[PDB]
């Protein structure tokens with residue numbers, strides 16, 4: 001999917017996320033959750049959250065943001081060589097959590113969103129470029145694993 005000039009850009013950018021993994025992860029789930037409320041319903045431990053103050057105020061969400069961004073970061077550093085790390089992922093979201101690929105689209109968008117909000121002006125057009133393709137490659141490989149499982153819905 002990507003050139004290493006592009007990989008280069010992705011890890012450049014992930015350097016931003018790693019300086020504050022907990023904050024980045026919190027705002028991603030908040031951007032996910034507030035924009036597409038049906039997504040909250042897939043989490044039984046965040047179901048109670050009703051307002052953004054509550055989410056904001058929730059320590060368990062900051063926690064889940066770190067797990068999520070820690071796992072993706074683990075995949076991105078593989079530079080597309082991630083069958084081993086993604087299968088387990090795709091299996092769990094399809095069979096156990098029942099997560100529609102559309103939701104993986106929403107969170108992909110939510111990361112691009114967040115990044116511009118936290119780093120206005122230092123999230124280059126080129127960087128957006130690389131990051132979007134990287135998220136697409138991630139999403140595409142999951143989509144395939146999802147097809148195998150007939151995880152239609």
Ligand code: HEM
Nearest residue numbers: 039042043045067068071072088089092097099103104107
């Ligand atoms: C970049 C995308 C994502 C990554 C890297 C990610 C990562 C993870 C990891 C590492 C776990 C725990 C281990 C496991 O169950 O496999 C997990 C659990 C879970 N994920 Fe995701 N996830 C992603 C997207 C999503 C989305 C979009 C949703 C729903 C809109 C979601 C819903 C859940 C749920 C419900 C669980 C179980 C939560 C619990 O522990 O109670 N995930 N995810």
